[PDB]
Amino acid sequence: PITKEEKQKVIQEFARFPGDTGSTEVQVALLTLRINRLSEHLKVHKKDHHSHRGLLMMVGQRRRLLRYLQREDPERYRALIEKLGIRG
Amino acid sequence: KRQVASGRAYIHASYNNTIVTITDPDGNPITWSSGGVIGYKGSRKGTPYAAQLAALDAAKKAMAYGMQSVDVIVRGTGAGREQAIRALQASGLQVKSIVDDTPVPHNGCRPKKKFRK
Amino acid sequence: RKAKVKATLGEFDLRDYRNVEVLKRFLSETGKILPRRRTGLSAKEQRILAKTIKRARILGLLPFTEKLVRK
Amino acid sequence: MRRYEVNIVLNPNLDQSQLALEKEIIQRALENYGARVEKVEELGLRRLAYPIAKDPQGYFLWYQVEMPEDRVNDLARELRIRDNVRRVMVVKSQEPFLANA
RNA sequence: GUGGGAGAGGGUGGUGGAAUUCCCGGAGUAGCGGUGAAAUGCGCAGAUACCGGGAGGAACGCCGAUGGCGAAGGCAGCCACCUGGUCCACCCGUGACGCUGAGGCGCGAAAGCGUGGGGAGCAAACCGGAUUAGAUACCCGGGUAGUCCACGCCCUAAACGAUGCGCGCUAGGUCUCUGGGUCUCCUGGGGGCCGAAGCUAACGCGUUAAGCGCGCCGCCUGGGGAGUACGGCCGCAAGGC
Ligand SMILES: [Mg+2]
Ligand SMILES: [Mg+2]
Ligand SMILES: [Mg+2]
Ligand SMILES: [Mg+2]
Ligand SMILES: [Mg+2]
Ligand SMILES: [Mg+2]
Ligand SMILES: [Mg+2]
Ligand SMILES: [Mg+2]
Ligand SMILES: [Mg+2]
Ligand SMILES: [Mg+2]
Ligand SMILES: [Mg+2]
Ligand SMILES: [Mg+2]
Ligand SMILES: [Mg+2]
Ligand SMILES: [Mg+2]
Ligand SMILES: [Mg+2]
Ligand SMILES: [Mg+2]
Ligand SMILES: [Mg+2]
Ligand SMILES: [Mg+2]
Ligand SMILES: [Mg+2]
Ligand SMILES: [Mg+2]
Ligand SMILES: [Mg+2]
Ligand SMILES: [Mg+2]
Ligand SMILES: [Mg+2]
Ligand SMILES: [Mg+2]
Ligand SMILES: [Mg+2]
Ligand SMILES: [Mg+2]
Ligand SMILES: [Mg+2]
Ligand SMILES: [Mg+2]
Ligand SMILES: [Mg+2]
Ligand SMILES: [Mg+2]
Ligand SMILES: [Mg+2]
Ligand SMILES: [Mg+2]
Ligand SMILES: [Mg+2]
Ligand SMILES: [Mg+2]
Ligand SMILES: [Mg+2]
Ligand SMILES: [Mg+2]
Ligand SMILES: [Mg+2]
Ligand SMILES: [Mg+2]
Ligand SMILES: [Mg+2]
Ligand SMILES: [Mg+2]
Ligand SMILES: [Mg+2]
Ligand SMILES: [Mg+2]
Ligand SMILES: [Mg+2]
Ligand SMILES: [Mg+2]
Ligand SMILES: [Mg+2]
Ligand SMILES: [Mg+2]
Ligand SMILES: [Mg+2]
Ligand SMILES: [Mg+2]
Ligand SMILES: [Mg+2]
Ligand SMILES: [Mg+2]
Ligand SMILES: [Mg+2]
Ligand SMILES: [Mg+2]
Ligand SMILES: [Mg+2]
Ligand SMILES: [Mg+2]
Ligand SMILES: [Mg+2]
Ligand SMILES: [Mg+2]
Ligand SMILES: [Mg+2]
Ligand SMILES: [Mg+2]
Ligand SMILES: [Mg+2]
């Protein structure tokens, strides 16, 4: 699974400031963590479909958030993307 | 001619026939009987009366082998299993205990169409 | 009206599959696991007790089946 | 690392030398699979509900351990290779859930 | 975000006992089986019943519910691992990032198809025994595909709550699962029954709406002809849209 350790690490990483937990950046980070994870899982276990749905959903949430960021502040969006390496 | 004198009595009782096997304490048969072993042929093999008669045949045939006390074990639910037990009850054989062993699965095998639903 | 298995006990770990003389209290004349009617357990309770019993059986501590005496 | 309980049920006919040897192998395996032993309860022989391996009874070992998860199955695998090992049950440790306390 | 929770949600590997069947052995002997009654069938090459040993496959009794989980299909022995969803408390973080969703893409019971395994029990087709006025069927004895597994197709259904999704609003009572609480009880989230107002052709629905509203999607337009014909798309085919 994903330990509190690793998670806290990715928050501390992407946080806009100290204490920042639920900002778009962070959310996208966490989401991408879970997605790479779940995706690695599905690379094996080609048959676990129910989990795959979860994948789809996580992907969607992430895209919506990215979409928002891009509309709002293209700067921080480009930063976020290049930082996570997502589609670019 | 073992002259056994104490043993087990298995009543296998089905909607169809009743059949009784007397055995030594290690479970090896000595004598046996059934609705068919006596006069009965068709469905008559299953009535409780046939059961009584059969248990009694097994009994007598066993006492000839010199047997005195026996432990009853009852497999299957069928007309007159209770009758066969009752027949041993006083067969002259002392019945030491009765026990119900009826096999039931934890659901292994698909039943015949007759037995499902 | 007989009595319920829970009332007849003090504190006991429902998760302890090693402990027998408590567990066997929850099996019938046969080795069947007793209904809530008889166990007096709650939903969650009963449900935990099941797995407990089962583990116990696999460990060879409690039976899957028993013969029925008299009859 | 996570925290489990390894139950071992082995041959009750075992003499002292052989029993020492099996406990030896068990310890060694536990080590090579990366587990640390927090505590052990050796109950020894006890009367089984149903016969296992033609035997009316069995010798009981219980270990509480902390070990790496991705290992655990192999551990059990290895533990069962022994001809003399009748049952092995590894279980994730849980807290007590009680009633009437 | 933090801290908890319940769960047959999913995938992988392992493992347990009951039973069936078959094989080996012991003991035993005249029948067993089966039906309304029977017969075919099986049995002196020793069956049935009983005891011990073995192989193998498939499904998991009690728990078990009126229960739970899942978007649906669906999911049930136990163990570990991998993994999805979801509920509660705190009210800490972002600051409208929302809803719906043509097409697309994915999932999709059973049966069916392809290749390769597997095959205990069951069992379309089939071979028999009976019943009947005949019996192509209902009952009985056999039995192949199939049922099981891997991978790839198929895309249907009384795929049913015959009730699209989301949010707000409108009496209560009672039982229940699962949280948190100052724990007769209050407060969340599910599952049920009865019922206010209201709705309804009626039957019924009624905070789990079939009420009162707004948003968006799908769909209907008399019964046949017909889910047929033609065309197109998909499919190895059966056939599907
Ligand atoms: Mg008969
Ligand atoms: Mg072994
Ligand atoms: Mg949260
Ligand atoms: Mg959490
Ligand atoms: Mg599950
Ligand atoms: Mg599973
Ligand atoms: Mg498995
Ligand atoms: Mg068996
Ligand atoms: Mg033989
Ligand atoms: Mg008739
Ligand atoms: Mg013959
Ligand atoms: Mg003949
Ligand atoms: Mg001869
Ligand atoms: Mg046997
Ligand atoms: Mg075979
Ligand atoms: Mg076996
Ligand atoms: Mg039930
Ligand atoms: Mg649901
Ligand atoms: Mg294991
Ligand atoms: Mg989880
Ligand atoms: Mg705030
Ligand atoms: Mg602010
Ligand atoms: Mg949607
Ligand atoms: Mg399908
Ligand atoms: Mg299928
Ligand atoms: Mg064909
Ligand atoms: Mg096939
Ligand atoms: Mg073959
Ligand atoms: Mg058959
Ligand atoms: Mg016929
Ligand atoms: Mg006909
Ligand atoms: Mg016919
Ligand atoms: Mg008929
Ligand atoms: Mg047939
Ligand atoms: Mg074929
Ligand atoms: Mg409809
Ligand atoms: Mg819709
Ligand atoms: Mg939504
Ligand atoms: Mg509470
Ligand atoms: Mg409610
Ligand atoms: Mg409630
Ligand atoms: Mg209610
Ligand atoms: Mg009214
Ligand atoms: Mg009215
Ligand atoms: Mg109502
Ligand atoms: Mg309300
Ligand atoms: Mg209406
Ligand atoms: Mg309507
Ligand atoms: Mg409306
Ligand atoms: Mg019109
Ligand atoms: Mg018309
Ligand atoms: Mg059609
Ligand atoms: Mg045309
Ligand atoms: Mg056409
Ligand atoms: Mg295609
Ligand atoms: Mg073509
Ligand atoms: Mg068709
Ligand atoms: Mg369609
Ligand atoms: Mg359609």
From Swiss-Prot, chain A:
<comment type="function">
    <text>One of the primary rRNA binding proteins, it binds directly to 16S rRNA where it helps nucleate assembly of the platform of the 30S subunit by binding and bridging several RNA helices of the 16S rRNA.</text>
</comment>
<keyword id="KW-0694">RNA-binding</keyword>
<comment type="similarity">
    <text>Belongs to the universal ribosomal protein uS15 family.</text>
</comment>
<dbReference type="Pfam" id="PF00312">
    <property type="entry name" value="Ribosomal_S15"/>
</dbReference>
<protein>
    <recommendedName>
        <fullName>Small ribosomal subunit protein uS15</fullName>
    </recommendedName>
</protein>
<dbReference type="InterPro" id="IPR000589">
    <property type="entry name" value="Ribosomal_uS15"/>
</dbReference>
<dbReference type="GO" id="GO:0019843">
    <property type="term" value="F:rRNA binding"/>
</dbReference>
<comment type="function">
    <text>Forms an intersubunit bridge (bridge B4) with the 23S rRNA of the 50S subunit in the ribosome.</text>
</comment>
<dbReference type="GO" id="GO:0022627">
    <property type="term" value="C:cytosolic small ribosomal subunit"/>
</dbReference>
<dbReference type="GO" id="GO:0006412">
    <property type="term" value="P:translation"/>
</dbReference>
<comment type="subunit">
    <text>Part of the 30S ribosomal subunit. Forms a bridge to the 50S subunit in the 70S ribosome, contacting the 23S rRNA.</text>
</comment>
<dbReference type="GO" id="GO:0003735">
    <property type="term" value="F:structural constituent of ribosome"/>
</dbReference>
From Swiss-Prot, chain B:
<comment type="subunit">
    <text>Part of the 30S ribosomal subunit. Interacts with proteins S7 and S18. Binds to the C-terminus of IF-3; however exactly how IF-3 interacts with the 30S subunit is unclear. May contact the C-terminus of Era.</text>
</comment>
<dbReference type="GO" id="GO:0019843">
    <property type="term" value="F:rRNA binding"/>
</dbReference>
<dbReference type="GO" id="GO:1990904">
    <property type="term" value="C:ribonucleoprotein complex"/>
</dbReference>
<keyword id="KW-0687">Ribonucleoprotein</keyword>
<protein>
    <recommendedName>
        <fullName>Small ribosomal subunit protein uS11</fullName>
    </recommendedName>
</protein>
<dbReference type="InterPro" id="IPR019981">
    <property type="entry name" value="Ribosomal_uS11_bac-type"/>
</dbReference>
<dbReference type="GO" id="GO:0003735">
    <property type="term" value="F:structural constituent of ribosome"/>
</dbReference>
<comment type="similarity">
    <text>Belongs to the universal ribosomal protein uS11 family.</text>
</comment>
<feature type="compositionally biased region" description="Basic residues">
    <location>
        <begin position="109"/>
        <end position="117"/>
    </location>
</feature>
<dbReference type="GO" id="GO:0005840">
    <property type="term" value="C:ribosome"/>
</dbReference>
<keyword id="KW-0694">RNA-binding</keyword>
<dbReference type="Pfam" id="PF00411">
    <property type="entry name" value="Ribosomal_S11"/>
</dbReference>
Curated annotation (Swiss-Prot), chain C:
<keyword id="KW-0694">RNA-binding</keyword>
<dbReference type="GO" id="GO:0003735">
    <property type="term" value="F:structural constituent of ribosome"/>
</dbReference>
<dbReference type="GO" id="GO:1990904">
    <property type="term" value="C:ribonucleoprotein complex"/>
</dbReference>
<protein>
    <recommendedName>
        <fullName>Small ribosomal subunit protein bS18</fullName>
    </recommendedName>
</protein>
<dbReference type="GO" id="GO:0006412">
    <property type="term" value="P:translation"/>
</dbReference>
<comment type="similarity">
    <text>Belongs to the bacterial ribosomal protein bS18 family.</text>
</comment>
<comment type="subunit">
    <text>Part of the 30S ribosomal subunit. Forms a tight heterodimer with protein bS6, also interacts with protein uS11. Binds to the C-terminus of IF3 and to the central section of Era.</text>
</comment>
<keyword id="KW-0689">Ribosomal protein</keyword>
<dbReference type="GO" id="GO:0005840">
    <property type="term" value="C:ribosome"/>
</dbReference>
<keyword id="KW-0699">rRNA-binding</keyword>
<keyword id="KW-0687">Ribonucleoprotein</keyword>
<dbReference type="GO" id="GO:0070181">
    <property type="term" value="F:small ribosomal subunit rRNA binding"/>
</dbReference>
Curated annotation (Swiss-Prot), chain D:
<dbReference type="InterPro" id="IPR014717">
    <property type="entry name" value="Transl_elong_EF1B/ribsomal_bS6"/>
</dbReference>
<dbReference type="InterPro" id="IPR000529">
    <property type="entry name" value="Ribosomal_bS6"/>
</dbReference>
<comment type="function">
    <text>Located on the outer edge of the platform on the body of the 30S subunit.</text>
</comment>
<dbReference type="Pfam" id="PF01250">
    <property type="entry name" value="Ribosomal_S6"/>
</dbReference>
<comment type="similarity">
    <text>Belongs to the bacterial ribosomal protein bS6 family.</text>
</comment>
<keyword id="KW-0694">RNA-binding</keyword>
<protein>
    <recommendedName>
        <fullName>Small ribosomal subunit protein bS6</fullName>
    </recommendedName>
</protein>
<comment type="subunit">
    <text>Part of the 30S ribosomal subunit. Forms a tight heterodimer with protein bS18. May make transient contacts with protein uL2 of the 50S subunit during translation.</text>
</comment>
<dbReference type="GO" id="GO:0070181">
    <property type="term" value="F:small ribosomal subunit rRNA binding"/>
</dbReference>
<dbReference type="GO" id="GO:0005737">
    <property type="term" value="C:cytoplasm"/>
</dbReference>
<dbReference type="GO" id="GO:1990904">
    <property type="term" value="C:ribonucleoprotein complex"/>
</dbReference>
<keyword id="KW-0687">Ribonucleoprotein</keyword>
